[PDB]
Design a binder for this molecule. Structure first.
Ligand code: DO3
Ligand code: DO3
Ligand code: CL
Ligand code: CL
Ligand code: CL
Ligand code: GD
Ligand code: NA
Length: 128
């Protein structure tokens, strides 16, 4: 699924993501735009053999199992294939663990370089 800006905000807000670990809702829509272009099915191969999956591009090295990332962890306890669903439940619950893990939203390279220190509220502007 390719999500609208307002449509994704309402879904992230309903799955409790709004102000999670002090990160306002704008930081999260910001990250999804530049990680996936709001596309749940996005995949990107990394040079180490791991792959990033879904709207927040969650990495197979630590967080889920795609059966081709040798001696890797599955700390979400999910197949990576579940992170590609039109339903963002899996991606949100998985993200709650990552952003809690010590490094906050810096774990997302596109948030750090394109959202951190910007007017992030702009990303939910006009939505009900
Ligand atoms: C809502 C409208 O803006 C729709 N929009 C009309 C055309 N816009 C004109 C403008 O944005 O004033 C210029 C192109 N636009 C640039 C950008 O927005 O970054 C990219 C395409 N957009 C992406 C999006 O908006 O989600 C969809 C089409
Ligand atoms: C031409 C306009 O599109 C200018 N635009 C600024 C104003 N936009 C307009 C809007 O999207 O209605 C509102 C904020 N916008 C939200 C979003 O687009 O997702 C994020 C910033 N954008 C990023 C981008 O466009 O890729 C910068 C360019
Ligand atoms: Cl915000
Ligand atoms: Cl594996
Ligand atoms: Cl933090
Ligand atoms: Gd924009
Ligand atoms: Na893994």
């Amino acid at each position: 699924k390719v999500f609208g800006r307002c449509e994704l905000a309402a879904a992230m807000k309903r799955h409790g993501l709004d102000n999670y670990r002090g990160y306002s809702l704008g930081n999260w829509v910001c990250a999804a735009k530049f990680e996936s272009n709001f596309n749940t099915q996005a995949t990107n191969r990394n040079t180490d053999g791991s792959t990033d999956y879904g709207i927040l591009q969650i990495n197979s090295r630590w967080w889920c199992n795609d059966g081709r990332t040798p001696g890797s962890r599955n700390l979400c306890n999910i197949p990576c294939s579940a992170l590609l669903s039109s339903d963002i439940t899996a991606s949100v619950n998985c993200a709650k663990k990552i952003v809690s893990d010590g490094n906050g939203m810096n774990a997302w390279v596109a948030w750090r370089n394109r959202c951190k220190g910007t007017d992030v509220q702009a990303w939910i502007r006009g939505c009900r």
